[PDB]
Write a protein that binds this ligand. Structure first.
Ligand SMILES: O=C(COc1ccccc1Br)NCCc1nc2ccccc2[nH]1
Length: 215
């Protein structure tokens, strides 16, 4: 695989979003992944709807949490593969109150037919990402609440608790790293991103990696 990849440089990643006071990171992770795959599949970069999942995916638990793998199954099995646009189904859960599901009246912004779950191995995840694009991952983010920049090398790695999006890596740096999109606005971290060291399972990053299949 190349020494370094950054899918932001490809124009494949939407702006950093704001989950607010809601445990909906699982939805931001899954939808951010779909956004990037939809662009890479030859379409304009389009903001897609986290609220669709938060309100309508009853396998997951709204502002009380969820799993990207369950979100991807819900989209395919319960929503005909459709992911609505952000503009037609905008995010409304920032104060912790998710509106009831509405089934009518939205605009389809992307279609997926499935998803992949990747091996629990940072090298294979990086090789997949280099060719195929950003990867949704679960992490332990408990120790991310003081991060202001640099490469994190001592991530507390004990319990998965947050969904995020791998968008790149750099194996040439003095400390090789992953580049991760969060959903805590651009006012946290490095314009909304964090670099964590790569190759030591920082933050349990290898454990639950996935990506949508557009089609
Ligand atoms: O909705 C998510 C998705 O993150 C994951 C969490 C666990 C596994 C995979 C993923 Br993705 N997190 C917010 C709600 C939450 N807070 C937790 C604190 C401690 C343990 C579990 C927790 N779940």
């Amino acid at each position: 695989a190349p020494a370094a990849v950054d899918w932001r440089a490809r124009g494949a990643v939407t702006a950093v979003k704001d989950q607010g006071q809601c445990g909906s990171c699982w939805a931001f992770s899954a939808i951010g992944n779909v956004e990037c795959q939809w662009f890479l599949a030859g379409h304009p970069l389009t903001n897609l709807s986290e609220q669709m999942l938060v309100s309508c995916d009853k396998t997951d638990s709204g502002c009380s949490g969820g799993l990207m793998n369950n979100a991807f199954e819900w989209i395919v099995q319960e929503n005909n593969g459709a992911v609505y646009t952000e503009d037609s189904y905008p995010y409304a859960s920032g104060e912790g109150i998710s509106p009831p599901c509405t089934t009518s009246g939205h605009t389809v912004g992307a279609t997926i037919t499935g998803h992949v779950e990747l091996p629990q191995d940072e090298a294979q995840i990086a090789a997949w990402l280099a060719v195929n694009g950003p990867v949704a991952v679960a992490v332990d983010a408990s120790s991310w609440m003081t991060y202001t920049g640099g490469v994190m090398t001592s991530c507390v790695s004990e319990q998965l608790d947050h969904g995020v999006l791998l968008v790149g890596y750099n194996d040439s740096a003095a400390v090789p790293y992953w580049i991760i999109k969060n959903s805590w606005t651009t006012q946290w971290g490095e314009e909304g991103y964090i670099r964590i060291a790569k190759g030591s399972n920082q933050c349990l990053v290898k454990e639950e990696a996935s990506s949508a299949v557009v089609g």
